[PDB]
Amino acid sequence: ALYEYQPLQIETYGPHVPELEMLGRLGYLNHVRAASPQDLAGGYTSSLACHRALQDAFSGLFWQP
Amino acid sequence: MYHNSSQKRHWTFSSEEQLARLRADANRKFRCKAVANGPNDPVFLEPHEEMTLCKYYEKRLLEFCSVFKPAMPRSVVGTACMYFKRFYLNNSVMEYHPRIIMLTCAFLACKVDEFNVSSPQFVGNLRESPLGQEKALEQILEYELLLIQQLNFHLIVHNPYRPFEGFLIDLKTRYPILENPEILRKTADDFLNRIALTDAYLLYTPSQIALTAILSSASRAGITMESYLSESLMLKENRTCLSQLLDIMKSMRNLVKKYEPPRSEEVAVLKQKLERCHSAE
Amino acid sequence: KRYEKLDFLGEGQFATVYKARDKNTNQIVAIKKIKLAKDGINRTALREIKLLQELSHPNIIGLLDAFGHKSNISLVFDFMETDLEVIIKDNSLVLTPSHIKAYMLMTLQGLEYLHQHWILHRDLKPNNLLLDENGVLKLADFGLAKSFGSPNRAYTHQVVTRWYRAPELLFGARMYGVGVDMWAVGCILAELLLRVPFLPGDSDLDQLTRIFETLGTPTEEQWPDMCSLPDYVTFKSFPGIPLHHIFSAAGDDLLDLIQGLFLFNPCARITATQALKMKYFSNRPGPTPGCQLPRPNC
Numbered sequence: 001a002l003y004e005y006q007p008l009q010i011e012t013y014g015p016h017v018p019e020l021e022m023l024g025r026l027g028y029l030n031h032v033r034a035a036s037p038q039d040l041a042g043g044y045t046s047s048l049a050c051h052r053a054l055q056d057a058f059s060g061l062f063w064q065p
Numbered sequence: 066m067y068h069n070s071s072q073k074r075h076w077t078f079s080s081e082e083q084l085a086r087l088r089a090d091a092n093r094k095f096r097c098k099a100v101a102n103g104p105n106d107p108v109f110l111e112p113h114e115e116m117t118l119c120k121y122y123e124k125r126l127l128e129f130c131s132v133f134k135p136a137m138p139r140s141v142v143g144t145a146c147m148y149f150k151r152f153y154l155n156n157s158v159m160e161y162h163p164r165i166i167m168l169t170c171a172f173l174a175c176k177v178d179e180f181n182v183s184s185p186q187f188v189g190n191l192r193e194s195p196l197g198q199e200k201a202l203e204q205i206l207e208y209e210l211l212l213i214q215q216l217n218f219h220l221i222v223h224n225p226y227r228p229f230e231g232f233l234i235d236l237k238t239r240y241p242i243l244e245n246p247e248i249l250r251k252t253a254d255d256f257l258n259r260i261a262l263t264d265a266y267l268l269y270t271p272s273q274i275a276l277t278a279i280l281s282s283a284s285r286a287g288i289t290m291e292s293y294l295s296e297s298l299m300l301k302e303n304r305t306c307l308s309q310l311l312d313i314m315k316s317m318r319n320l321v322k323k324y325e326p327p328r329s330e331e332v333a334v335l336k337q338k339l340e341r342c343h344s345a346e
Numbered sequence: 347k348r349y350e351k352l353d354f355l356g357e358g359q360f361a362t363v364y365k366a367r368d369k370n371t372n373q374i375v376a377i378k379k380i381k382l383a384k385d386g387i388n389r390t391a392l393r394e395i396k397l398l399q400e401l402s403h404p405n406i407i408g409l410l411d412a413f414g415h416k417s418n419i420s421l422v423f424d425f426m427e428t429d430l431e432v433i434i435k436d437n438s439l440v441l442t443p444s445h446i447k448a449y450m451l452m453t454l455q456g457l458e459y460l461h462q463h464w465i466l467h468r469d470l471k472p473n474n475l476l477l478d479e480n481g482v483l484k485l486a487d488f489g490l491a492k493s494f495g496s497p498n499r500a501y502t503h504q505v506v507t508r509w510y511r512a513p514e515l516l517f518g519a520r521m522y523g524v525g526v527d528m529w530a531v532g533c534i535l536a537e538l539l540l541r542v543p544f545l546p547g548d549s550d551l552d553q554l555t556r557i558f559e560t561l562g563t564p565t566e567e568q569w570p571d572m573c574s575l576p577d578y579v580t581f582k583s584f585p586g587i588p589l590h591h592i593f594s595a596a597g598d599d600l601l602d603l604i605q606g607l608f609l610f611n612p613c614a615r616i617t618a619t620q621a622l623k624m625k626y627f628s629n630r631p632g633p634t635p636g637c638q639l640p641r642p643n644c
């Protein structure tokens with residue numbers, strides 16, 4: 001009765017958003033304000049802002065009521 | 066996230082006809098409520114006059130949230146205006162005056178968003194006497210629960226600004242054909258204000274509103290960005306999805322095209338008739 | 347009018363919770379009335395409402411209803427018989443590795459959903475992990491929970507129960523990510539494995555001292571760029587106790603989970619998703635089914 005991890009498929013009605021790690025080497029983070037060293041001392045990485053902006057940009061595009 | 070939100074589930078309607086149905090139903094409900102309790106008095110407002118007064122008081126809501134002494138973030142203003150739109154989608158202007166509901170929507174948007182403002186500050190942002198500020202605060206607190214009930218306790222509003230920024234990031238990244246997409250930023254701010262003036266917030270997703278603003282700015286500036294839709298969004302293959310998105314964008318652009326701002330004489334007459342309706346309850 | 351009170355469950359400093367039953371579905375719920383100057387509806391109640399209205403997961407509490415009357419409101423959640431604190435503190439019922447794995451799995455699945463929705467449960471502790479008779483763990487209260495994505499937002503460093511506070515929050519980080527929830531989850535797992543609060547601090551300085559003397563002070567190669575936080579103070583270099591000495595009866599995979607959840611660098615700290623992908627949850631002792639989890643009887 002073991003456990004297998006499933007990636008929590010939640011269906012966003014929009015274009016695919018690249019993963020958070022595969023996000024600075026696609027070029028996105030060049031166009032996001034760099035996180036300050038103090039901010040980086042916490043959990044903030046300036047790719048959270050990029051990833052949230054991209055997820056809200058593509059959240060519902062392929063959807064109308 | 067919008068795709069799971071209550072804004073998608075409940076407050077996103079299929080056509081302007083459904084919006085007009087809801088508003089005419091609210092107006093008719095108030096009219097029948099007034100008639101059945103002690104039958105065609107011209108004191109009442111029509112649904113289109115109610116819409117004119119709603120447009121006027123949404124303009125005043127933008128003006129208030131723009132001169133707010135602490136710099137109100139634009140998400141808070143968008144949330145307050147969305148609350149105004151919904152509240153008067155399902156409620157009649159003659160029951161609840163739009164100035165008090167204007168201030169109440171601003172208040173609840175300041176609280177639901179985490180723009181932390183004390184009540185004395187919030188009423189100090191009102192161009193009334195301290196007595197008038199105290200009374201306005203009393204009315205706001207009276208009407209706050211009513212506003213939250215009339216929103217069906219759906220307090221999270223998704224504004225097109227964050228999808229606008231995310232589209233700009235993706236556009237600077239994967240769309241090298243476009244250089245310096247910030248000219249688009251200025252013109253799309255203009256179009257986004259224009260489109261916030263209309264009822265498109267209840268009809269399209271914030272992502273679609275942001276994309277329409279961006280592509281409208283491109284079209285005004287002579288840039289073609291069909292390669293950003295077909296490619297870089299992979300609408301080259303699901304042609305039906307591409308045409309569906311284009312229809313959404315064209316519909317919403319036309320919706321901004323046909324918007325007629327509230328007048329100056331008509332708004333004066335409507336304000337006077339509304340205050341006569343409120344005085345004689 | 348639609349809900350009848352059944353029991354006087356208790357109070358929090360901003361709510362009165364009564365067990366209740368609805369006359370429409372004869373389902374047992376928990377109604378939460380909020381108390382009452384010149385500010386209006388309490389912001390913790392509005393935060394509950396606004397955040398729980400747009401979440402629907404098995405392992406997050408859901409407000410089945412919300413209503414109210416003059417100047418006051420009442421929320422209506424699933425009724426949850428216990429929390430994880432009464433399960434931890436009850437000496438009668440044992441917590442086998444499978445039971446611990448079940449609680450951790452439910453907690454991290456709920457928190458993974460909550461983090462994929464860019465919401466941060468900034469107060470995670472065994473008190474706030476309720477669970478029903480079906481043994482389904484739910485994240486309890488969202489009266490201090492936020493959205494952690496936007497840069498333009500200045501958070502507050504004081505918001506999580508001290509015992510379950512990450513080092514960066516004690517150092518005064520006004521900006522943070524999912525590391526605060528994950529540190530509180532590591533502390534919950536440690537309390538679940540020891541049955542006593544891991545790192546019980548008397549103050550922020552004492553909490554930091556206990557964190558550092560239990561895990562070792564970070565050396566700026568483990569938590570690089572640490573010295574920039576607003577309330578950073580240098581500490582005596584503690585060696586820290588090896589994890590296989592604090593939890594003398596935890597498997598190697600569980601030790602790796604502990605190490606990941608207790609990384610000082612709030613960016614190297616594992617997230618709920620990659621915590622769920624670790625060998626601990628996939629190894630031989632499966633999590634217990636919610637039907638076989640122990641319930642504290644009376």
Ligand SMILES: Nc1ncnc2c1ncn2[C@@H]1O[C@H](COP(=O)(O)OP(=O)(O)OP(O)(O)=S)[C@@H](O)[C@H]1O
Nearest residue numbers: 355356357358359360361363376423424425426487
């Ligand atoms: N969903 C629920 N089902 C059943 N009982 C609940 C539920 N939520 C809360 N309770 C109970 O109600 C009590 C008070 O509610 P809380 O959630 O603790 O409010 P609170 O403000 O967090 O309390 P404090 O501040 O920690 S003392 C809790 O201690 C539980 O015993």
Ligand SMILES: [Mg+2]
Nearest residue numbers: 357358359473
């Ligand atoms: Mg409590």
